Design a protein around this ligand. Structure first.
Ligand code: SF4
Ligand code: SF4
Ligand code: SF4
Ligand code: SF4
Ligand code: FES
Ligand SMILES: [Zn+2]
Lengths: 182, 63, 98, 48, 56, 279, 689, 118, 92, 85
């Protein structure tokens, strides 16, 4: 269910699709107040699957982030991250996979640390989080998940292949008269 | 976290997890998991049924 | 005239950030269209940057020595008001730098 | 006792370091002149 | 040498679904819920009959 | 044009074979490439009588032949040189008053290479601006063309020089090919196009050379006799010329046994001689 | 005739009458197996895997090649279709070698994915299989021709996309081989895409060969920096190691193709890397130091050195954030010049995106009618753009050139190799002037290297007057054909922020080489100038620097890049920088704070707030902001010099595979230079085309 | 059929059987097998790293079941008791020497198992 | 004998840095199997196509692979891609 | 038999092949049969002429010359030559 029915509000709540305006609360953001205002002005007012301009939205740490479980005494780093939300189509190597891809939005966190421990040359990730990406049936669902868990989101929208006129008669098109073209 | 580990692995790679559920009865759990997979696939194990291997070894497991 | 000719030495950079299809940026956009080449010819070596976005607010940023920025709002300003704002920006250098 | 060779082999597969010059070198102005250590040879530079 | 019917053509994958409206729903209430009858346009025999015909 | 005979006859038969490059040019292809070279020189202000020093070394047979035939068409004087050191290159450049110098950058001028020798002789090439006319010590030195692969400041590539003019949008006009116009300066003597044609005819009649017989010119091709008996002979009477610059006699014998009756212009330190047909 | 109705598995569907059966099924979510039909190649019926059953027709019908007939009923799930697919799969797998373990296509193979779903399941071909000797195509294509299924995808791609003619079916029967009849290499600047278009392991990525498997890789969508087009790519990695690069579908940029440098120069990031700050002694010995010591030394030098003696160099791989940080830091020190090299500067003002960008976008060549290259070599500068231009020239595009006679795969007129033709066209006394006049859409593509010449400003003015007087920039048809194909993403990003490349510091005692490694001369830096180098690989900038500060590669930082048509693309962090390397903006922020002029960026969010203060359009990703001042910016002005030297206009790229530090520090690019440079070198054009 | 100690076999000519196809790595339920592959200079496809964590191994036989060339097997040796967790970290050296030591009995058992359907 | 990394050596050895000693492989690949298989000589087969299973029976070696001995150059040795054995035509 | 070029020295690129003057007059009639926009059609008659004048076998150099004459790809000429017995 990649595309919610835009003809009816039951697609998803309007509050979820809203992109809240940034409020300058840090000293640097107060210094860069005009930049914050201009980013609020230029950024898309809503996030929908039909959009065309990618955008990065900051992690809104407020009551919306109330429903997170990763703000652990031993883990104070997860609940500030910016995920990447995009539809990951099948790689160009193959076109008819056993399990087709591109029917879901991948939500991916960047790798915090990766290093080969030397005794056996074994790959170790310093952050057990972000090891495996999340998958959401709808961009609205992914955005709602980001809002609930207090994650910022860099949303990039899919680029699908254009429709083309295909016919076997194009393999035998008549070039034309020699005299006329000359 | 055996259930989560199974969910993070293919069907066959999570099959040995059922051996350690009831290590006293290590084949009945295998039978239950295989029956679940077959029901998902909508088939039956004709070879196992006709060779009587599953019933015999499940009764040995019960013993 | 004189203030236009003094842009090269009074300032270090002049940036005009506005929108293509908004009434807020109409005066600034018209002034830039009319008066860009006058200032550019009078100040061939002065940075006169023009940037436009879909919904950006009209700002004229005057950058003075030691990177001192003087962005000024220019929304719903007539070409006369745009010229007055620019003239003020090319007249604050003595006060701003000192 | 030969662990460092194995660790260097591990590291060199993804992040092999740049062997900086160690000692006196030829200076052409501000640039240190040291011959390239590429085993491959650009045959177009040595042809006819 | 017979490989055409190695894979099972018939499988036990049949699923059957039964949907029922609430038992306590009356005919007019169901007609109003489905939209064939208006909310306040009730207690009129002709309108009820028209809604029933359209629903049928 | 004197060189358009076989071009007008058929234009499809093979004219010259460059064995060391495995490149075969028909008469149409050769005419197109030589016209490209001539138009490229013409567009760069190369008037009649301008000097071009051929410092290319044996191997680049195709470039040498194209330069020779284009200079014949364009009308500029072509002077082969044998400079093996910076002093020799300086003396040749000063004496010849050359407008252009065509060289092979990677050839060995002893310990140093040709491009390094040119840079040492002309220090102004290192600091020459991109796309700007060079300010050299020499009075009339204006072009340094190299058949190399990399780009050196102050010098231009052979392909960059040539201009493959079209039949409609071309504006450059090529002057008529002149027999009396000097073409070669070898051994302190000047060879004209008519003189080269006369030498070609004399060597054809005195060495038992037919209209249809391959001629294998080995080693260097800058010699006036090599030019006369090679590409010039192909343009005149359609003889199939095969250039084997910097190839051993065994490989030459193989590529000759591929043919029936080959006139072997043997390479040597002295002006190239010739031998009997076939073996 | 406009919207017919068909039936797919008994389900009515409204489709267009120009659709094929395969297109109609795919538009409705019905997946039909295929091996030869490529969505961007000509339709062929080599395989028969797309055979489907249609009611009231006796033969199975190839869904990919057959148009939709109104009122037809297509039965994809029927047992007859199952039998057809099983028969075709059995015939495909009859002579296929049992090489799945030793074949790089395993785990991502269409043959396997279709035999597991649509095949019968078991084989009965108990006979000798055909064997074909493998061929040699070069260090990029690994050939196992016994695995081929004779689907002609490679031949069609070479003929129609790449434009080269070196593949085909030789012979007939079961002994037909799909490849070069003679022993030659496959060098077309797009040699890596035949691996993508080969459905089987017949053509595999030789540098990637045997390295990994698809199920053990994690893929990230990012943007290339090896070319100014910023082709969208998918980087597949296994832990800390980047394993491979693949194309991504982006019709606005590169369709679905990438060049070899994009695909095979990523391994240059795995060697010759800088992983620690270093200081150079008087004798030239390099010692590793801490970040604190290097920052303190650079801060001391910044504080004691006068502002007028402070310079900088902006490299190729300099992003929006890094350039913003450096510009603000140098502004806080009253430094207004960001270039120290007096030779090789771009003569384009940073005032207008119309001035310094490709105003017709990449799709312009498809839109335009006449294309005029001026010292531009799209075959090397942008092979995917070259393929797009070839596709356009097939239909109704005419290409002229006023530079070096290149070896483009299509036909192009050669107006000349010098600026004399440009001067004649500007005066209007040239035959091509009327050609531009009568053209519906003229377009001019001038290389950044061509505009970097000594008479760069004069050439720019000549091109502007040509565009204005002819119709290249026309408001009547709302067309802006003036396009400048840049050569450095760093230059594009620097122009996008308002940094004038002509601002050159003649005598600079403090030089910041921001990753610059090309066009660097020993005389461009004074012998008594303190140099800091924000580099990633040590090739030139390491040798030119007193202090070396390791930086993060384009795959090692969250960066904003500007595709030369003006696209704001967001390159993402795939793997963290090696060792203790830091991304450049963080280093600049730390240096600024230590120098007493702190910058107001605690994070990338605040840095992008600063960027929005500079240019808001840089915050709208994968988008081109329209420029309403195209004609105002590119208007001809009286009295501006247009004098042009008669020297030839040249193309800067000599070796395609080695153009940057990463490319020069790549083993695959070294093999490509060893293998293809001499085969692709010719002082004379390819007349036979 | 006894599943003892993981070991790497070789052809009777002495060439190692493993072709670095990573099927055992994919099929390992506990992900104890780590394989890194680089083509040999002669052109073959062989592992440069083949590590099995005997502390992460459940001794299930999926590696030998999934091996298409019968390279990785589980020999009968069960007296693999080690005094060091590092000693329990098997690598290609140890696996190859163990296969060289235990090839005869492994060959006999594998021959018998092959002859069952044959 | 020829220097590696050269055009001829790379073109001969599948664009790979050939090592004659093979002890470099003994280190990198942790096995002397390259030397052990270099000890094995070339097998000459009359037919144009040979079949290799790795041993004497099915399941005792590797899956069946068919090697084409009818090459562009007569009598060109062809290596098995599962095992290390080399095959060639009897005469040419 | 084999679909690829044998590595024979007698059939290498260095082997010479030029059409005889009678054949050059013969191809003019052959080219006139087919439209000027379709010179690709004459590949088979040109191969037949080559076989007539080259000891009943078509060499690789002859294939190169035929491809150059008809402005058609050498790979296409090879495909035409190999497809027919
Ligand atoms: S292409 Fe490779 S993975 Fe696919 S079926 Fe053939 S051998 Fe197996
Ligand atoms: S080599 Fe690959 S792409 Fe080419 S015909 Fe064969 S299967 Fe198709
Ligand atoms: S026996 Fe099972 S757990 Fe152990 S290495 Fe083999 S596949 Fe992995
Ligand atoms: S399954 Fe066998 S051949 Fe494949 S990688 Fe594992 S041990 Fe090697
Ligand atoms: S996909 Fe239609 S015939 Fe191949
Ligand atoms: Zn074998």
């Amino acid at each position: 269910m990649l595309l919610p029915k835009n003809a009816i509000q039951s697609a998803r709540y309007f509050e979820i699709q809203k992109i809240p305006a940034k409020i300058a609360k840090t000293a640097n953001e107060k210094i860069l107040s005009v930049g914050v205002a201009q980013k609020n002005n230029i950024q898309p007012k809503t996030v929908t699957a039909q959009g065309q301009i990618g955008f990065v939205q900051h992690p809104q740490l407020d009551s919306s982030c109330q429903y997170t479980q990763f703000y652990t005494p031993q883990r104070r780093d997860i609940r500030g991250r910016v995920a990447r939300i995009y539809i990951q189509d099948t790689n160009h190597m193959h076109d008819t996979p056993q399990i087709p891809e591109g029917y879901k939005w991948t939500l991916e966190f960047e790798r915090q640390a990766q290093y080969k421990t030397p005794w056996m040359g074994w790959s170790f990730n310093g952050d057990t989080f972000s090891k495996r990406n999340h998958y959401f049936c709808t961009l609205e669902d992914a955005i709602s998940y980001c809002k609930q868990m207090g994650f910022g989101y860099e949303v990039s929208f899919p680029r699908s292949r254009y429709h083309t006129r295909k016919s076997y008669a194009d393999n035998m098109l008549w070039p034309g008269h020699d005299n006329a073209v000359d | 976290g055996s259930e989560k580990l199974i969910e993070d692995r293919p069907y066959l790679q999570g099959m040995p997890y059922f051996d350690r559920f009831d290590y006293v009865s290590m084949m009945v759990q295998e039978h239950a998991y295989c029956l679940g997979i077959e029901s998902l696939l909508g088939t039956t194990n004709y070879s196992a049924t006709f060779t009587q291997i599953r019933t015999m070894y499940d009764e040995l497991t019960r013993i | 005239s004189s203030w236009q000719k003094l842009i090269g030495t009074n300032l270090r950079e002049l940036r005009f950030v506005f929108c293509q299809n908004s009434q807020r940026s109409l005066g600034l956009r018209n002034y830039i269209a009319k008066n860009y080449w006058n200032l550019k010819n009078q100040n061939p070596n002065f940075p006169l940057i023009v940037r436009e976005c879909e919904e950006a607010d009209p700002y004229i940023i005057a950058r003075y020595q030691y990177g001192v920025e003087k962005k000024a709002f220019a929304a719903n300003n007539n070409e006369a008001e745009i010229e007055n704002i620019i003239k003020t920006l090319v007249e604050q250098s003595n006060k701003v730098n000192n | 006792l030969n662990r460092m060779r194995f660790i260097t082999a591990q590291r060199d597969r993804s992040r092999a370091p740049w062997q900086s010059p160690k000692g006196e070198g030829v200076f052409q102005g501000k640039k240190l002149i040291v011959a390239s250590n590429s085993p491959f040879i650009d045959d177009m530079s040595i042809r006819d | 040498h017979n490989i055409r019917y190695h894979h099972e053509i018939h499988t036990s994958d049949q699923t059957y679904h039964s949907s029922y409206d609430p038992v306590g729903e009356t005919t007019t209430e169901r007609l109003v819920r489905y939209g064939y009858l208006n909310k306040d346009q009730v207690n009129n025999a002709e309108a009820v009959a028209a809604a029933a015909k359209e629903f049928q | 044009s004197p060189l358009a005979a076989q071009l007008a006859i058929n234009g499809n038969r093979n004219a010259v074979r460059y064995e060391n490059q495995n490149r075969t040019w028909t008469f149409n292809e050769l005419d197109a490439h030589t016209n490209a070279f001539a138009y490229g020189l013409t567009e760069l202000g190369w008037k009649a009588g301008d000097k071009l020093l051929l410092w290319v070394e044996k191997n680049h047979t195709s470039e040498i032949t194209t330069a020779q035939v284009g200079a014949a068409k364009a009308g500029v004087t072509l002077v082969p040189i044998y400079a093996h050191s910076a002093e020799e290159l300086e003396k040749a450049l000063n004496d010849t008053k050359a407008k252009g110098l065509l060289l092979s950058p990677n050839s060995k001028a002893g310990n140093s290479k040709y491009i390094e020798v040119v840079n040492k002789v002309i220090p102004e090439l290192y600091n020459t601006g991109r796309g700007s006319t060079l300010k050299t010590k020499f009075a009339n030195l204006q072009h340094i063309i190299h058949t190399g692969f990399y780009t050196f400041p102050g010098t231009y590539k052979f392909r960059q020089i040539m201009v493959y003019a079209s039949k409609n949008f071309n504006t450059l006009t090529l002057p008529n090919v002149e027999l009396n116009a000097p073409l070669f300066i070898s051994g302190n003597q000047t060879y004209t196009l008519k003189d080269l044609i006369s030498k070609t005819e004399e060597n054809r009649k005195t060495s038992k050379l037919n209209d249809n017989t391959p001629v294998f010119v080995t080693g260097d091709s800058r010699s006036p006799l090599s030019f006369s008996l090679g590409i010039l002979n192909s343009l005149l009477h359609g003889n199939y010329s095969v250039y084997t610059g910097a190839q051993d006699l065994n490989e030459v014998g193989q590529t000759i046994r591929f043919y029936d009756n080959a006139l072997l212009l043997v390479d040597g330190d002295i002006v190239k001689a010739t031998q009997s047909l076939k073996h | 005739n406009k919207q017919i109705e068909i039936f797919i598995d008994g389900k009515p569907a409204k489709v267009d009458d120009s659709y094929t059966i395969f297109q109609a099924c795919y538009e409705n979510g019905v997946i039909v197996p295929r091996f030869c039909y490529h969505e961007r190649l000509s339709v062929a019926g080599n395989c028969r895997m797309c055979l489907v059953e249609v009611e009231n027709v006796p033969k199975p019908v190839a869904a990919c090649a057959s148009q939709v007939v109104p009122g037809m009923k297509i039965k994809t799930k029927s047992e007859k279709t199952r039998i057809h697919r099983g028969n075709v799969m059995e015939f495909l797998l009859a002579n296929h070698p049992l090489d799945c373990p030793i074949c790089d296509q395993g785990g991502e193979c269409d043959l396997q994915d279709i035999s597991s779903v649509y095949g019968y399941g078991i084989s009965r071909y108990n006979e000798y299989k055909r064997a074909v000797e493998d061929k040699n195509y070069g260090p990029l294509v690994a050939t196992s021709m016994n695995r081929c299924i004779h689907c002609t995808r490679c031949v069609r791609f070479a003929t129609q996309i790449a434009g080269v003619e070196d593949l085909g079916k030789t012979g007939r029967g079961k002994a037909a081989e799909i490849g070069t009849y003679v022993e030659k290499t496959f060098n077309t600047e797009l040699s890596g895409n035949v691996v993508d278009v080969c459905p089987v392991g017949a053509l595999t990525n030789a540098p990637y060969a045997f390295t990994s498997r698809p199920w053990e890789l994690k893929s990230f969508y990012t943007s290339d920096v090896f070319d100014t087009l910023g082709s969208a790519i998918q980087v597949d990695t296994r832990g800390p190691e980047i394993m491979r690069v693949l194309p991504r579908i982006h019709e606005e940029i590169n369709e679905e193709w990438i060049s070899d440098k994009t695909r095979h120069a990523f391994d240059g990031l795995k060697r010759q890397r800088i992983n620690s700050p270093m200081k150079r002694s008087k004798d030239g010995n390099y010692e590793d130091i801490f970040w604190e010591e290097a920052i303190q030394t650079i801060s001391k030098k910044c504080l004691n050195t006068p502002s007028d003696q402070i310079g900088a160099i902006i490299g190729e791989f300099a992003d929006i954030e890094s350039i913003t940080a450096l510009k603000d830091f140098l502004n806080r020190l009253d430094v207004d010049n960001f270039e120290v090299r007096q030779h090789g500067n771009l003569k384009v003002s940073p005032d207008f995106r119309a001035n310094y960008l490709m105003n017709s976008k990449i799709t312009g060549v498809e839109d335009a009618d006449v294309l005029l290259l001026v010292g531009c070599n799209p075959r090397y500068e942008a092979p995917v753009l070259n393929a797009r231009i070839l596709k356009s020239t097939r239909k109704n595009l005419k290409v002229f050139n006023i530079g070096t006679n290149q070896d483009l795969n299509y036909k192009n007129v050669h107006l000349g190799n010098s600026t004399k033709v440009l001067k004649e066209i500007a005066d209007g006394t040239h035959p091509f002037a009327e050609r531009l006049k009568k053209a519906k859409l003229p377009m001019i593509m001038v290389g950044a290297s061509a505009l970097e010449r000594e008479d760069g400003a004069e050439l720019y003015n000549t091109l502007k007057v040509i565009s204005n007087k002819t119709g290249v920039i026309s408001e009547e048809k709302s067309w802006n054909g003036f396009n400048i194909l840049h050569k450095e993403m760093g230059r594009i990003n620097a122009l996008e922020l308002g940094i004038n490349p002509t601002s050159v510091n003649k005598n600079a005692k403090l030089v910041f080489i921001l990753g610059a490694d090309n066009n660097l001369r020993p005389e461009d830096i004074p012998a008594d100038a303190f140099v800091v180098y924000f580099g990633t690989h040590g090739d030139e900038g390491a040798y030119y620097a007193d202090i070396i500060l390791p930086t993060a590669a384009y795959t090692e930082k969250n960066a904003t890049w500007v595709n030369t048509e003006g696209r704001v693309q967001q390159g993402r962090l795939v793997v963290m920088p090696p060792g203790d390397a830091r991304e450049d903006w963080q280093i600049i922020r730390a240096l600024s704070e230590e120098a007493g002029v702190p910058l107001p960026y605690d994070s990338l969010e605040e840095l992008r707030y600063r960027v929005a203060e500079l240019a808001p359009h840089l915050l709208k990703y994968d988008y081109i902001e329209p420029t309403i001042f195209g004609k105002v910016a590119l208007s001809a002005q009286q009295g501006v010099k247009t004098t042009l030297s008669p020297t030839p206009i040249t193309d800067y790229i000599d070796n395609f595979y080695m153009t940057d530090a990463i490319s020069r520090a790549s083993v695959t690019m070294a093999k490509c230079s060893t293998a293809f440079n001499h085969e692709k070198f010719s002082n004379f054009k390819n007349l036979a085309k | 059929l006894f599943r003892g100690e993981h070991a790497l076999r070789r052809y009777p000519t002495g060439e190692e059987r493993c072709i670095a196809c990573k099927l055992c790595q994919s099929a390992c339920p506990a992900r104890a097998i780590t394989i890194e592959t680089e083509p040999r200079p002669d052109g073959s496809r062989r592992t440069v790293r083949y590590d099995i964590d005997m502390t992460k191994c459940i001794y299930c036989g999926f590696c030998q079941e999934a091996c298409p060339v019968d390279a990785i097997v589980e020999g009968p040796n069960y007296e693999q008791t080690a005094y060091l967790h590092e000693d329990l970290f098997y690598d290609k050296y140890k696996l190859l020497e163990n296969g060289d030591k235990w090839e005869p009995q492994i060959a006999r058992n594998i021959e018998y198992l092959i002859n069952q359907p044959l | 004998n020829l220097n590696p990394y050269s055009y001829e050596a790379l073109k001969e050895n599948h664009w790979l840095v050939s090592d004659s000693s093979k002890k470099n492989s003994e280190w990198t690949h942790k096995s002397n199997a390259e030397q052990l298989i270099a000890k094995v000589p070339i097998i000459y087969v009359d037919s144009n196509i040979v079949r290799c299973i790795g041993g004497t029976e099915i399941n005792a070696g590797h899956p069946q692979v068919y090697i084409q001995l009818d090459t562009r150059k007569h009598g060109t040795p062809q290596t098995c891609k599962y095992c290390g054995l080399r095959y060639a035509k009897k005469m040419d | 038999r084999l679909a690829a070029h044998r590595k024979n020295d007698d059939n290498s690129d260095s082997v010479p092949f030029e059409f005889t003057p009678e054949n050059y007059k013969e191809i003019e009639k052959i080219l006139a049969k087919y439209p000027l926009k379709q010179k690709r059609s004459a590949v088979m008659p040109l191969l037949y002429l080559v076989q007539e004048q080259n000891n009943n076998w078509v060499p690789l150099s002859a294939m190169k010359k035929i491809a150059k004459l008809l402005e058609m790809p050498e790979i296409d000429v090879y495909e035409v030559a190999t497809f027919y017995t």
